[PDB]
Design a protein around this ligand. Structure first.
Ligand code: CHL
Ligand code: CLA
Ligand code: CLA
Ligand code: CLA
Ligand code: CLA
Ligand code: CLA
Ligand code: CLA
Ligand SMILES: CC(/C=C/C=C(C)/C=C/[C@@]12O[C@]1(C)C[C@@H](O)CC2(C)C)=C\C=C\C=C(C)\C=C\C=C(C)\C=C\[C@@]12O[C@]1(C)C[C@@H](O)CC2(C)C
Ligand SMILES: CC1=C[C@H](O)CC(C)(C)[C@H]1/C=C/C(C)=C/C=C/C(C)=C/C=C/C=C(C)/C=C/C=C(\C)CCC1=C(C)C[C@H](O)CC1(C)C
Ligand SMILES: CC1=C[C@H](O)CC(C)(C)[C@H]1/C=C/C(C)=C/C=C/C(C)=C/C=C/C=C(C)/C=C/C=C(\C)CCC1=C(C)C[C@H](O)CC1(C)C
Ligand SMILES: CC1=C(/C=C/C(C)=C/C=C/C(C)=C/C=C/C=C(C)/C=C/C=C(C)/C=C/C2=C(C)CCCC2(C)C)C(C)(C)CCC1
Lengths: 87, 227, 200, 96
């Protein structure tokens, strides 16, 4: 493992993509998700988590960061450990 | 009103964290300091007082981690006395020194000395003015307290320092206590991982940051194991 | 704003050349978005693969286009089955010119506009449809417009660079950049003029 | 009203074909777990052919046809049931 290695690049790409997705409303986030929504194609702003504390102009939160990082690490684990199984 | 301090505040946290409490930046992501539903040890006064006691103990602890090691390394104190914190008799398997009495005798001494100090402190916390009333060997006069358990302006403020700007100084101490709690957390953490003392970890990071950091230390998670 | 040099089309004029046609502003910005994509593509292709962008013109030819298969850094699989020849140049160019021509005709109103909500023909940056992330409305869209245009001009200058370097050094922009960063005193245009750019 | 609806099935030909073929095709796709990258449908059809040569004699208790039959029919029926549920729910107001 090193900077620029395949595993490092996989995880960095995964976390960047996930955080961008839930920052711009492409993935369910703290301030906007399917809780109390209508259909699969539309998420809604969560009043309970609305203005829960952020200095990012889209309202991106630390819990959003932690959730996206956890999901990205989970996905990176799944993808990297594919091809490491013995068989 | 700064980055890394808006992370924790919310409707709940800002509902009760007005800001007059010393070093109140609103960072309460959990509902631990909520006045309604308070009780036991999760009431806001206990948390604030415990934060301050932890901060002061952490400042003393970090200073006692750094001072014997630095002063032995330069040569101020004896080398035998300038042990690292975790090898200075805290853990005899890890390391011990031959003090005046037996390390367990010292433990019992310091134990009852801390008992007699901390129980007085507690009774000031619960009954403020009662610590200056009973005749405590003629020492109650300077142990009356101040009504604030956190800040007894009696003996302990004998220099009367930080009086012109007490509010600013109150914030100074909270922030230093927070920094020292994190510092002591770290010192234990990279004493558990690296196996060396905090100053040696520091200088190792100063010389070669890319070879004496966390990610490199994962390969060498014990250094030399004394067990 | 342009404290560096010149100015933007909205206010001021270039002493180097009069404004002339308006549509030059539109033309400049699109040219710049294209040079941004071209310079970045040159940069990244020669970063991963190593081959210069200009030599990479022959990356697909009617006889030889399956060469491109798996020519991407870290690519999960080859583009097409290796040695099949099914990724023929004829196919890939046909698909390309179809998609480009459709995009450009919809851009300039030659054919139509498939989207029914505004998207006025003849604008640099409509943002109804081509702003999925809402970063213009987020704010500083105009600041981002100046930022955009400055990046445009810098990238066209960079592309004019990459072309010139190819004409003189015949080595590729990153190889030139690595040679210049390694020994900047004796890796510049003028020492290449001293060698004679190869032709002299 | 409170009368039973004789069209309770709501049998849709498009559902039947979509479920059947959208299980058959994925089950006919290459599967690297099976030998020669054979599909579940492929190995199942191979076992059917091998056992249909001996038409009266049933497959042996140890023959792999049983596991392939179960693991194919489950996925098929899952596609049938979920396809009906999803189609009739989308037609109704369950989703939008
Ligand atoms: C596990 C997957 C994966 C990993 C680790 C990388 C890793 C990398 N890619 Mg690759 N890529 C991957 C999949 C893919 N890449 C590409 C196409 C590209 C392009 C176009 C570029 C990279 C670049 C980079 C970088 C780094 C070396 C970039 C690069 O050259 O940086 C050096 C770049 O510009 N990759 C495609 C589409 C065919 C892929 C498909 O999944
Ligand atoms: C295995 C088959 C399968 C599954 C899981 C789904 C799944 C789904 N379909 Mg359906 N669909 C299918 C086949 C399937 N489809 C077929 C064949 C057709 C064509 C007839 C359709 C037509 C169709 C329409 C028209 C619509 C859907 C929609 C949906 C989604 C809404 C929820 C739902 O109805 O299912 C419940 C599904 C879940 C995944 C919930 C959790 C279920 C748990 C995990 C248990 C499932 C076990 C799993 C399926 C494994 C089966 C194997 C077996 C051995 C146990 C969901 C993603 C709707 C939608 O919004 O999609 C955009 C919609 O409008 N589907
Ligand atoms: C996209 C890239 C990618 C690739 C190529 C793979 C490839 C693989 N993964 Mg990985 N994986 C990925 C992404 C990927 N994964 C991601 C993003 C995640 C999420 C973190 C995972 C999580 C994951 C887990 C947790 C496991 C794999 C496993 C596997 C292997 C497949 C074995 C299998 O399905 O047998 C077919 C098996 C079945 C059909 C049995 C299904 C489960 C049974 C029925 C029990 C389920 C209980 C209950 C009924 C479920 C409720 C519903 C294979 C090497 C497995 C592995 O490596 O094994 C050695 C394994 O355990 N993957
Ligand atoms: C089923 C288990 C359980 C549950 C659900 C609770 C739930 C609660 N307790 Mg009780 N408690 C329990 C077990 C439990 N406790 C046990 C076993 C003890 C004896 C040690 C206590 C002693 C205790 C006291 C003295 C107080 C509470 C308080 C509280 C409340 C606040 C929780 C909090 O902020 O601490 C969250 C957790 C922490 C801050 C961490 C503290 C550090 C501990 C020591 C970590 C231990 C981890 C370890 C794996 C467990 C070892 C346990 C052993 C038996 C909440 C209603 C407080 C309250 O009512 O205020 C409203 C309060 O004053 N509890
Ligand atoms: C083909 C690309 C292209 C196009 C269409 C334009 C078009 C324009 N530029 Mg841009 N520009 C370009 C390349 C281009 N420029 C490059 C590479 C640089 C970097 C050095 C600049 C730097 C630049 C500055 C600093 C300024 C302009 C300005 C202008 C306007 C001047 C009108 C004119 O005569 O230009 C028509 C196009 C040409 C004459 C082609 C240039 C050919 C040369 C002479 C060879 C117009 C909108 C001015 C402006 O905004 O006007 C208010 C201004 O201040 N441009
Ligand atoms: C890097 C220079 C740059 C800058 C500052 C801008 C700035 C702008 N553009 Mg321009 N644009 C550029 C390059 C640039 N663009 C290029 C190269 C193209 C050609 C592809 C375009 C094509 C284009 C169109 C067609 C439109 C804009 C619009 C806009 C505005 C809103 C979008 C925005 O905030 O962009 C911000 C730019 C950045 C933050 C630059 C960083 C780019 C990163 C590195 C690339 C990431 C890509 C990746 C897919 C991200 C995924 C995230 C998720 C997971 C703003 C004025 C829209 C507008 O104004 O509508 C009113 C509009 O309609 N631009
Ligand atoms: C056309 C339909 C048909 C007919 C006429 C028979 C007829 C017979 N079967 Mg077969 N069988 C059938 C369908 C049929 N089976 C199907 C669909 C299955 C799969 C569930 C089986 C599985 C099966 C087994 C496992 C066995 C038979 C056996 C038998 C014999 C008792 C008898 C000759 C038995 C046999 O071989 O006879 C001794 C036996 O062991 N059959
Ligand atoms: C890190 C720490 C506490 C950390 C708590 C944190 C982050 C809490 C965060 C949160 O609450 C907030 C803010 C907001 C909430 O909404 C969210 C959470 C997330 C829940 C305490 C350290 C506390 C550290 C302490 C008390 C250090 C004590 C040291 C002492 C006593 C002396 C030790 C020695 O004597 C020996 C043993 C041997 C001698 O040789 C050497 C010396 C070193 C001298
Ligand atoms: C990605 C990549 C990888 C593959 O391997 C190979 C590949 C070829 C496919 C390749 C793809 C290439 C692509 C798509 C390229 C796009 C290029 C484009 C659109 C370039 C634009 C080039 C623009 C120029 C020169 C303008 C010059 C104008 C100049 C100086 C004057 C400016 C000016 C003005 C007007 C006013 C001032 O006041 C003063 C002055 C006079 C200075
Ligand atoms: C539209 C829209 C809507 C959504 O809501 C939100 C949104 C953000 C997605 C947004 C989308 C934005 C997009 C798609 C942006 C694309 C940006 C891109 C591709 C930028 C590339 C910018 C690149 C530049 C300037 C190059 C500089 C080049 C220089 C110095 C060269 C240096 C040099 C030279 C010449 C000689 C040496 O030898 C070698 C080297 C190469 C070193
Ligand atoms: C742009 C911007 C910026 C930057 C940003 C960033 C870059 C961010 C990042 C972020 C991040 C980067 C984050 C991360 C996170 C992470 C996480 C949170 C992780 C997690 C993990 C986990 C949870 C795990 C789990 C596990 C394990 C342990 C083992 C087993 C498996 C698993 C995986 C499951 C700044 C600020 C400067 C400014 C503003 C703007």
């Amino acid at each position: 493992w090193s900077i620029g290695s395949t595993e490092n690049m996989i995880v960095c790409f995964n976390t960047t993509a996930i955080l961008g997705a839930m920052r711009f409303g492409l993935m369910p986030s703290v301030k906007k998700n399917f809780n109390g929504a209508s259909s699969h194609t539309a998420m809604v702003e969560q009043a309970n988590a609305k203005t829960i504390g952020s200095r990012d102009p889209s309202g991106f939160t630390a819990v959003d960061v932690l959730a996206g990082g956890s999901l990205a690490t989970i996905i990176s684990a799944g993808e990297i450990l594919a091809g490491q199984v013995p068989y | 009103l700064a980055p890394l301090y808006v992370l924790g505040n919310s409707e709940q946290s800002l509902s009760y964290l007005d800001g007059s409490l010393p070093g109140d930046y609103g960072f309460d992501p959990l509902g631990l300091s909520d006045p309604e539903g308070a009780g036991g040890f999760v009431n806001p006064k206990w948390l604030a007082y415990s934060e301050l006691i932890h901060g002061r103990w952490a400042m003393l602890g970090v200073a006692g981690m750094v001072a014997p090691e630095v002063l032995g390394g330069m040569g101020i104190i004896p080398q035998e006395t300038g042990l690292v914190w975790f090898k200075a008799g805290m853990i005899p398997a890890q390391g011990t020194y031959d003090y005046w009495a037996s390390p367990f005798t010292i433990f019992w001494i310091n134990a009852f000395l801390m008992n007699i100090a901390e129980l007085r402190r507690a009774q000031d916390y619960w009954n403020p003015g009662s610590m200056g009333k009973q005749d405590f060997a003629g020492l109650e006069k300077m142990l009356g307290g101040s009504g604030d358990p956190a800040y007894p302006g009696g003996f302990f403020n004998f220099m009367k320092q930080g009086e012109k700007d007490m509010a600013a100084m109150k914030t100074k101490e909270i922030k230093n206590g927070r920094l020292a709690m994190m510092a002591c957390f770290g010192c234990g953490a990279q004493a558990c991982m690296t196996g060396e003392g905090p100053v040696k970890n520091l200088v190792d990071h100063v010389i070669d940051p890319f070879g004496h950091n966390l990610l490199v230390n994962f390969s060498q998670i014990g250094g030399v194991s004394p067990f | 704003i342009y404290p560096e040099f010149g100015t933007y089309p909205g206010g001021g004029e270039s002493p180097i050349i009069p404004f002339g046609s308006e549509k030059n502003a539109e033309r400049e910005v699109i040219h710049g978005r294209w040079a941004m994509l071209g310079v970045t593509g040159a940069w990244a292709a020669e970063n991963g693969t190593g081959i210069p962008w200009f030599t990479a013109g022959t990356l697909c030819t009617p006889d030889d286009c399956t060469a491109v298969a798996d020519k991407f850094p870290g690519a999960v699989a080859p583009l097409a089955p290796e040695g099949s020849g099914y990724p023929s140049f004829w196919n890939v160019l046909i698909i390309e010119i179809v998609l480009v021509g459709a995009a450009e005709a919809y851009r300039t109103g030659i054919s139509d506009s498939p989207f029914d909500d505004g998207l006025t023909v003849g604008d640099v940056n409509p943002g109804g449809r081509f702003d999925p992330l809402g970063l213009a409305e987020s704010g500083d869209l105009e600041e981002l417009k100046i930022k955009e245009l400055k990046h445009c001009r810098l990238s066209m200058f960079a592309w004019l660079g990459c072309i010139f370097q190819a004409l003189a050094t015949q080595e590729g922009p990153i190889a030139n950049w690595q040679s210049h960063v390694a020994d900047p005193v004796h890796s510049n245009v003028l020492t290449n003029a001293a060698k004679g750019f190869g032709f002299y | 009203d409170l009368k039973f609806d004789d069209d309770w099935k709501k049998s849709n030909v498009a559902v039947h074909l979509a479920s059947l073929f959208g299980w058959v095709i994925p089950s006919a796709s290459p599967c690297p777990a099976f030998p020669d990258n054979a599909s579940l449908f492929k190995v199942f059809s191979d076992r059917i052919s091998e056992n249909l040569a001996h038409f009266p004699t049933g497959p042996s208790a140890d023959d792999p046809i049983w596991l392939y039959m179960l693991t194919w029919h489950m996925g098929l029926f899952a596609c049938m049931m979920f396809g009906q549920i999803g189609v009739q729910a989308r037609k109704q107001g369950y989703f939008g």
